[PDB]
Amino acid sequence: IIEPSLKALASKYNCDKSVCRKCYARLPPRATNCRKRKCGHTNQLRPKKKLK
Amino acid sequence: KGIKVTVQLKIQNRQAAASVVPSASSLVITALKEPPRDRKKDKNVKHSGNIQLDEIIEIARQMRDKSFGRTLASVTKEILGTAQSVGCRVDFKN
Amino acid sequence: VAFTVDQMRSLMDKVTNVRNMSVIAHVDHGKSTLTDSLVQRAGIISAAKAGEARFTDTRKDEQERGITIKSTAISLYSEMSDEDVKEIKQKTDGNSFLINLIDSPGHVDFSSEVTAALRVTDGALVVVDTIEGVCVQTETVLRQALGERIKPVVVINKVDRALLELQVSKEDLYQTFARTVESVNVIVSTYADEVLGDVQVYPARGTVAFGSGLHGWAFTIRQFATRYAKKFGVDKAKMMDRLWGDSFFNPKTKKWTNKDTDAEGKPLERAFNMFILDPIFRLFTAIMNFKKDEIPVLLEKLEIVLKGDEKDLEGKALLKVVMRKFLPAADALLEMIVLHLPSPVTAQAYRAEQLYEGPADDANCIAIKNCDPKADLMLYVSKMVPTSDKGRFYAFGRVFAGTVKSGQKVRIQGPNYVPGKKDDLFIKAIQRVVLMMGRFVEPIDDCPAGNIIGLVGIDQFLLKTGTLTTSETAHNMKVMKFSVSPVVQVAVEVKNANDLPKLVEGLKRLSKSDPCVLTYMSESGEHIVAGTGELHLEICLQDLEHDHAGVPLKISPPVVAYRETVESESSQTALSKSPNKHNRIYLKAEPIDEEVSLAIENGIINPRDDFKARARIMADDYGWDVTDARKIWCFGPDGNGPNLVIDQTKAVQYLHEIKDSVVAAFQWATKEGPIFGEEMRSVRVNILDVTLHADAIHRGGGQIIPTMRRATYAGFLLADPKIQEPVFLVEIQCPEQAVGGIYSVLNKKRGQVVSEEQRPGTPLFTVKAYLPVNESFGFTGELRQATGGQAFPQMVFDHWSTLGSDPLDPTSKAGEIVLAARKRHGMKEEVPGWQEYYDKL
Amino acid sequence: VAAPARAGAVAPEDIWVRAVNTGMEPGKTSFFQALGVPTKIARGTIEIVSDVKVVDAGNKVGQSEASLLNLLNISPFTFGLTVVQVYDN
RNA sequence: UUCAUCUAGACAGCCGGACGGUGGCCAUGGAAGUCGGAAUCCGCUAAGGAGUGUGUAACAACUCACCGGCCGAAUGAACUA
């Protein structure tokens, strides 16, 4: 219904992120600095909790 | 032989089973060792060993996957001891 | 067709003219709606009436709620030509055929009606989907009928919603239904027996179909393979062979070639979607967009009848009218059933054996095997079929080899009756032979070998399920199976104590209306109920509130009870006295290892055996001193439990007369326990000193009661206060594609796994696990949700292991439970210590 | 020589294979479903009943494709650390 | 502000492999580099840590690592204001 390797490129958008531990914001897989200032720039990022 | 972390390869010809074991580091530490290093030890942890053995684990290294591709006894001058917390032999290993 | 009993028993007389099977599935895959269209097409009815539409006449109050719980084999009238029967490998003859087809609700957690419908038929109708294929639950019901030995028939249903609510593409829809085949090549290759050999179903021989319920359309490969075999000049069996795999006809080179490549490299589209699905695809855009550019004119290119009220409608309701006409309901369905799904006579050639078990080449066994319809009557009610006549219960059974009549005094035996007894062997005269019809039953008179029907007035003595034998040497069949095993528990006791007699009557009535159910009593004192699934249980419970019992019933989370044990030896010899301060009993409490304490409750060491020969057992091999065993007085609780009383004294000259006084007080003490209020386990008393004062006016009865009481009361507190918690045994069978999901359940819900094993190369594993009594209240849900319904928990009560916390400690596990246990009584809220129970000068 | 192979890095030659038995017990064929190839069972043993032209010679290889080709013992990086420059006495 | 790696050849970064003894000592229902704790070595080269994480039921496999081609030549560790 989505092909294994075709569903792999679908993750490169809504899966391979990094959730801010105070903003939640959707950012890059190797990014370590926030892009909004509702925190005034921070580095507290845990590669977004994907599926199991 | 060896009953804890011992690799066992089963090669069969459609109902004609032949036995061949990789003789892991676990198999050899019990291979030449006496009774307190062979049976009666399950509730009592095995972390005992120091006594020298010599060139006899040179032939025992010919049973532990020869995929190291170098010099047998010179490689175990490290393997048996730092990974083998049972037997210290000639204090030149660590 | 409107028949009469003679027309029924007419096709019943014909053994090879009956289709004994049910319906294997993967939940709501158009099974109930499939059978409704079959009565509307040509389903045999009674001596009058005319009822055709959809649901209603198959389900009742199940119609207002929404489910199918009545799985009966409604026999129908088939009209199979003599040319079809020309290659059927059966001894069948005629035009008027019979169809003994059962409903059977597919999904898991209800594999009760599922395993009981398999125990009364030679095959089954599997219903897989286009939007699902061959998944987990069909894997369940399919591998289930294979470890039972049945004939498989596929119907990729809802190809209607696969081209309307979605819509697929030509050759891509090839691998869609070809992948449902590659998924069937997986279940067959492992769970199919060597007794049937090559049985992987291929619609390349007309084994897999194509249909939809609200469309009234039923398609079989053989349908257009035969209505086109002649219009091509090709063999009938070789035309459907060049329709799967290397099948590319060229409307240019005009040849059925193997390779689709030409002298350039250009392809060739499938002749199956070129002569069978090509114009079939034209029927799609035909009514979907209303293209009268083909519609009626294309109707002649396909050979269809256009009648008045047909074009009198519009839209999708219009496409359903030509779907039931291009591929008619009863026509194509009864087609493959009367084709590769046999009659008891020709299919029992392998089924007969695993049916009747116990005796190798038994006498009645060879009769059931070759099938003799007038020999010694071999019947087995796989699960009674009670109705709604104020408690009018019937019996659902398979008449293997033999005839049954109205008023026959047969030996109605039970799974407890084995040749050398009379237990459950209630040889009673049957009042009348019943003939069930889909959802209702009417009065008939007799039936032979290879039939499916019921009996009445047997309910009065037959409990659960029963085998009907007229021959005494008759053993019985295999006691069902159930790889599901009930794993639900509830404190289903009276909400209104005035009608408790109604609850126990209906508890058996639940067993009466269920394939597998545990309606026992609690070891605490309440009425415990155990079901298959949560969904399952829930249903049978409201049914227990309306008719089965009929009045307010309060269900509560399964009230528990454990054992009161000791850890180390008693700290000091506990001295005791009477409310007189006269008689003084001094003793201690010692540890009984599993093998010897469990051996007490086993019967190896029992009071109803002389203390001389019982002392020999213990002394000689086990290792229990001879004088200590010839001194064991009482086995608390009552008189056979693992809480002994071994006397190790020497003085007190009046000990011999009030020996039973110490013994009887102790049976009363271990029964109504010290730490909370239940019974102990593995604690044997060692009485060392005692004092006998004045006459028996002070030596016995109640003067001696508060004595032996505070005696072991103080001793249990000194022998180390601990508890042995009740361990459960569950062996979950689940696919390797979900082994670590159950392992997650273990590293969480106390993984005391006895050991993990199975069969290297097969799907489902044999997961042996030790699990607490309470660590199992909802265990069913977590197991299947952890790794799909692929998990199958085998329940039963096991042993008692070491419990970490301490009883007298209010915040730790043990103590918190005990403090909550005393509020369960409705009194005292504390743990009284042995300090306020020890004796001094 | 010797050098077996790697997955999902290069798609060099056209992926071709014959149609006989592999002899493996039924298991990794749930992915052979969702993928789309003409398979069947030869009395239990997993048998390919057709010579398949899987993927092309010049595209992005991956996880799903390497699973079925690594079970066939196929090694596309058929090469071996060899020579470059030459010098003698 | 102290501290490194290098221009006849560094970084971030683009590309290729990822060794065995080893399914290491035990502990195991089950832990083969990746629940746990202690050992934390050399045979050999450019190199591969009893292994960075993911993911396995455990394997497997991906992959940080260490090592070669491309990198313009610098900016990385770390805090001060």
Ligand SMILES: CO[C@H]1[C@@H](O)[C@H](O)[C@H](OC[C@@]23C[C@@H]4[C@H](C)CC[C@H]4[C@@]4(C=O)C[C@@H]2C[C@H](C(C)C)[C@@]34C(=O)O)O[C@@H]1C
């Ligand atoms: C054959 O079906 C069996 C198995 O499912 C299993 O043996 C099950 O065990 C029930 C319990 C049995 C325990 C022993 C026999 C002593 C203590 C009893 C229990 C109460 O604490 C523990 C388990 C769970 C039940 C609590 C919840 C009241 C028991 C009971 O019958 O009361 O019983 C049914 C009838």
Ligand SMILES: Nc1nc2c(ncn2[C@@H]2O[C@H](COP(=O)(O)OP(=O)(O)O)[C@@H](O)[C@H]2O)c(=O)[nH]1
């Ligand atoms: N249109 C359409 N509806 C369906 C089909 N199958 C099931 N349904 C719907 O599902 C409802 C009940 O189905 P049910 O009898 O539970 O299916 P079963 O559990 O397999 O017997 C019907 O009222 C339909 O509306 C189908 O093939 N086509």
Ligand SMILES: [Mg+2]
């Ligand atoms: Mg239904």
